[PDB]
Symmetry: D2
Subunit: 121 residues, 4 copies
């Protein structure tokens, strides 16, 4: 299991200790407050009012929590995933990432606190 912070200004993402393997079932719960620039902060689903101007993940709002498994494309996490199984052939370390436009992370602030565990399978 893994517990840590995912900083909004971390463009590279936060590598976790979870290595997602075929057949694994995982649960993620994310909390906290972060911003992509403005003074306001949003929770792990991000800002539903802000248009997508080239986000790393088009399947979640600006300022949402997303992830990559190994070198997968970005997958939404938002507030978390409950007893979740990955698509076939997706495997590897989970990196958690704040959803913003590449090269625009420098004015971000805050972080999300995240727990990830493997479930029975």
């Amino acid at each position: 299991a893994w517990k840590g912070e995912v900083l909004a200004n971390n463009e590279a993402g936060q590598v976790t200790s979870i290595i997602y393997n075929p057949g694994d079932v995982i649960t993620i719960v994310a909390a906290g407050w972060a911003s992509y620039g403005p003074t306001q902060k949003w929770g792990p689903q991000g800002d539903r009012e802000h248009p997508d101007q080239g986000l790393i993940c088009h399947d979640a709002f600006c300022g949402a929590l997303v992830m990559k498994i190994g070198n997968s494309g970005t997958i939404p996490v938002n507030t978390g995933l409950f007893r979740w199984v990955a698509p076939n052939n997706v495997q590897g370390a989970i990196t958690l990432i704040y959803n913003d436009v590449p090269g625009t992370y420098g004015n971000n602030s805050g972080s999300f606190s995240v727990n990830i565990g493997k479930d029975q399978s």
Copy 2:
């Protein structure tokens, strides 16, 4: 396990199929968008800027997800609870409720989608 929706305008709350028993460990993940009145919506942590004017749960923000276990007082859920154990003396069906002031639910909108499961113990 249980999965279902909790409407923001449902003052009485949504009953689940989860019966919390002594020693049980549970995980909850909540998602979605709701409002206590304004045209904006907030996630399951609610609106951190809005004063408490008599909320059903003083330990979470206005517009947060909270719960009762049996006849307990309100307990915060927010985006969820990871491998969580209830206080001593708490037992019974879990009811999920949007955090607002009694009698003021009629102008609320939206809902949260919630999963609850019992973990290993």
Copy 3:
């Protein structure tokens, strides 16, 4: 979860800390060596060659591990149970018992080491 020893000479059984509730899934693993009288010992499935002379559980061999859940009749445990759900309407404290004839426990010897856990549900 519970871990402990179940003595072969204990007629009343070893009352565990596990309270089986409706919907619970449990796993039991039992090990060790015990006897109902003879100098030879057998594992948790008992002695397959010994006739049933009035055993507390007719559904397992003499010297097997069995249980009662609450006020239930005896249920075989043998080497254990994997992600097991009880029959409808069976619930309460799990008592583990060595399978022998009532009144004949005084010449028994040995014990089984048992783990019981609740699984996800």
Copy 4:
């Protein structure tokens, strides 16, 4: 999770669907009756009275259930393993095998029924 039978006369062992990965926690429960030649049968702990004449696993009795993880050496399973973690560096497919002397499996009979699952981690 995996469920299947391990025949006592199967010198090559029974390959399972479980790929043990670093960090995984597993539970195994084994049941049934088998023999390494004699007319008696023994449970998954084997025959505690028969000396080791060159068994594939020197850490378990003759007629016990054992396993290999990947190309590891044999590891005892007996009646099962409860929320068990492998030694560092051991990984790969779990193969279950009856403990007997190489080249002497042809007179064996019976089998063990085994369940393996991954636990929370």
